[PDB]
């Protein structure tokens, strides 16, 4: 098959050696243009992929220094991360880092040991680099190393064996081909839109290796698992033959102070807290968590003792018991560390709302990722993190050439771009640069073709002048992409535009400015945002309206206990517990505006849904309907479609816009918000926290270290996909009462369980 040599933990390159440079658009059109060549089997290549521009570089990290960027792509063939054989030899690429005897990096062509086997040149594609492991000669051992001492080569000690349906070395090689559990029952599609409407076809984050349904276990549980076809049983233990070996050498070791603190030599062990600890002969007769024979000779000098994980010092036992969390503090020139890595969000709007007239045209295309403005300021010397604030620094990526004060190409999205240090923008350029539209193409039902170059483009069924196999429109197809009309699959906030009838160059736009659609389209920031971290509960801010998409749901005389959303003239999804009890009429409350509790303004829409609702079986998905059409206005949004079929991101944050109180002010009045990612699919249903307390096809949101959900008044708002470049919507916020309770979320309610009236009574009121 042509994908099974692909895995990548992705965002670098490098000032390479010698690079070669073409261009492709598809994935299986590699299998006609990048290995025809026999100029290398590419150690590295380098497909910048929005723009059909593509890369390769003749030597990596193996031989050279390293760069990054987003979008930044050292693809490395699985070939070149082959630390394995079997058999007679066939794709070993190995790099063994320490072996029983104390081998690391020398190289075949040193003379020494023996009269020279082999160097870089000697084959033109089996890569005899510097030490790197290789099964060249046709001598079928596979593992061995050429060394500084002569002594023995071939034995089973650093001949690694991957038994490969479970784990080896850092437990990460879980690409296993099995599928089959402990029941003897079977394990679901991911594959269709049947038995269950989802599927986890390979357009998604890469890291979690889903194929069709072998067994992924990333959290390493004791025996594997995932779920089964049957909704009774849902998931369980995967089940498999047995396990031993574990081929351990003396394996991976850190250069400097990022390490686990194993090593600590020290003829002491003291702090400010006390006297002594546990040579464990004071074992006698409690038994301790950790004891010396799992450390079976890692120089316990009688004991002076030796550091259990964590950090840089020893944190055992003592016959007291004060802080076992206690580490010894001996004073020495130790160690340096800091915090790391990831990410690039935090982007300004560039003043748009009347455009500040320091930018030109539509940027139609600048030779890769840049149609970019030029609003131009000073830019930032890239060894301080400095100056207004945003979610990350330099100091993540260092060694990507970021050294003196480089002015260093950051992350892709400007083109060759620098952190601009002005309210007026952010950002700008590095420091030595040498029929028409809905509006974003989502389910656009229209049949335009123009650029800024007039005419038509191509068709992108077409393989005249750009070519595909996968990405035909009919392999898209949910609400057609035919012929050569316009259709921008990013639908970007930047507007529409396409991969044009123009040949190689990144788009164009239409000839045709957007259509005004605001206050009624799906939930647009118009005058684009503000933006800020999140990551504190109940709410930093509370901002004059720029979350303008509110309903508030409320009690029969009108206090506030939970919101809404509207998503027609008429037709609205709000929660219901307060309602979701008895199916009485007219007198339980909404009202369209109030960013706030009692403290209402005349302008807010406030005719009452006196037509109140609840579906055919009770559910918190209230369509609470307007009796009346809407009084629409610009600070009261509604959302639209509450649409089956589509399906939320994943990872990655959603929102709630939040009716709630206060926390550390004044004790009533405000909207605050929360910003809230899609839990690991192995929390709720679970043996040990909960065992099925839940009912698990509502749609949750929270993310790796705490939040809400939607508190009271949070209740019932635009359950919004941050889908398609701007606010969309699946479900509606469900309830809400009881603020901050720490790491527990609640309910958001789904549309597809209920349509027939939820989806129903919304027809054309």
């Known amino acids: 098959e042509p994908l099974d040599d692909y895995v990548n933990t992705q965002g670098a390159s490098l000032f390479s050696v010698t690079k070669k440079q073409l261009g492709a658009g598809s994935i299986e ?13 590419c150690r590295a ?10 890369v390769i570089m003749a030597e990596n990290r193996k031989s050279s220094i390293i760069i990054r960027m987003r979008d930044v792509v050292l693809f490395e063939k699985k070939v070149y991360l082959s630390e394995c054989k079997t058999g007679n030899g066939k794709n070993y690429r190995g790099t063994m880092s320490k072996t029983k005897n104390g081998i690391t990096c020398q190289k075949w062509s040193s003379t020494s040991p023996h009269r020279p086997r082999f160097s870089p040149a000697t084959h033109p594609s089996e890569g005899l680099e510097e030490n790197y492991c290789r099964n060249p000669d046709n001598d079928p051992q596979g593992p061995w190393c050429y060394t500084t001492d002569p002594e023995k080569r071939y034995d089973y000690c650093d001949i690694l064996e991957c038994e490969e349906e479970c784990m080896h070395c850092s437990g990460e090689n879980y690409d296993g081909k099995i599928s089959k559990t402990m029941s003897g029952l079977e394990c679901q599609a991911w594959d269709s839109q049947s038995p269950h409407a989802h599927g986890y076809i390979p357009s998604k984050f890469p890291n979690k290796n889903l194929k069709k349904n072998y067994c992924r276990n990333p959290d390493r549980e004791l025996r594997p698992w995932c779920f089964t076809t049957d909704p009774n049983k849902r998931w369980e233990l995967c089940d498999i033959p047995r396990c031993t070996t574990p081929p351990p050498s003396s394996g991976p070791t850190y250069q400097c102070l990022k390490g686990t603190g194993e090593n600590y030599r020290g003829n002491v062990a003291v702090t400010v807290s006390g006297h002594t600890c546990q040579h464990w002969s004071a074992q006698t007769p409690h038994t301790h968590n950790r004891t010396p024979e799992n450390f079976p000779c890692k120089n316990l000098d009688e004991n002076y003792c030796r550091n259990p994980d964590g950090k840089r010092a020893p944190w055992c036992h003592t016959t007291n018991s004060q802080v076992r969390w206690e580490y010894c503090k001996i004073p020495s020139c130790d160690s340096s560390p800091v915090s790391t890595e990831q990410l690039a969000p935090t982007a300004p709007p560039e003043l748009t709302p009347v455009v500040q007239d320091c930018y030109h045209g539509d940027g139609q295309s600048y030779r890769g990722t840049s149609s970019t403005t030029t609003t131009g300021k000073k830019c930032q010397s890239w060894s301080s993190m400095t100056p207004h604030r945003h979610q990350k620094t330099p100091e993540n990526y260092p060694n990507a050439g970021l050294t003196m004060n480089y002015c260093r190409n950051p992350d892709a999205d400007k083109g060759p771009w620098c952190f601009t240090t002005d309210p007026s923008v952010r950002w700008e350029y590095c420091n030595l640069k040498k029929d028409c539209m809905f509006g974003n193409g989502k389910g656009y039902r229209g049949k335009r073709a123009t650029t800024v170059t007039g005419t038509p483009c191509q068709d992108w069924a077409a393989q005249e002048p750009h070519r595909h196999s996968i990405f035909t429109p009919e392999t898209n197809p949910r609400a057609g992409l035919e012929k050569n009309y316009c259709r921008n699959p990013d639908g970007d906030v930047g507007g529409p535009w396409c991969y044009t009838t123009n040949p190689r160059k990144l788009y164009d736009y239409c000839d045709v400015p957007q259509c005004a659609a605001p206050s009624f389209d799906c939930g647009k920031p118009q005058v684009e945002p503000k933006k800020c971290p999140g990551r504190v509960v109940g709410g930093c801010v509370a901002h004059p ?3 303008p998409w509110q309903v508030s749901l409320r009690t029969r005389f009108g206090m506030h206990f939970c919101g809404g959303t509207l998503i027609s003239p008429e037709w609205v999804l709000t929660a219901a517990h307060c309602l979701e009890k008895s199916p009485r009429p007219s007198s339980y409350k909404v009202i369209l505006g109030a960013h706030q509790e009692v403290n209402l303004e005349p302008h807010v829409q406030e005719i009452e849904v006196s037509r109140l609702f609840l579906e055919p079986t009770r559910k918190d998905i209230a369509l609470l309907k307007l009796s009346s ?3 629409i206005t610009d600070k009261v949004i509604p959302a639209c479609l509450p649409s089956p079929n589509y399906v939320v991101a994943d990872r990655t944050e959603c929102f709630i816009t939040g009716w709630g109180e206060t926390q550390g002010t004044f004790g009533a009045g405000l909207l605050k918000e929360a910003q809230l990612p899609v839990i690991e699919n192995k929390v709720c249903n679970r043996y040990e926290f909960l065992n099925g307390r839940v009912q698990s096809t509502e749609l949750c949101a929270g993310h790796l270290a705490g ?15 941050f889908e398609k470049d701007k606010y969309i919507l699946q479900g509606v916020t469900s309830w809400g009462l009881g603020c901050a309770r720490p790491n527990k979320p609640g309910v ?18």
């Open 29 to 41: 059109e590699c299998a006609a243009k990048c290995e025809e060549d026999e100029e290398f089997t």
């Open 45 to 54: 290549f380098q497909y910048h992929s929005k723009e059909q521009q593509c």
């Open 545 to 547: 309206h720029s979350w």
């Open 629 to 631: 059409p809407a009084v």
């Open 707 to 721: 939040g809400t959900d939607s508190c009271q008044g949070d209740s019932g708002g635009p359950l919004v996909c």
């Open 748 to 765: 958001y309610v789904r549309v597809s369980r209920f349509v027939t009236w939820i989806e129903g009574v919304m027809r054309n009121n």
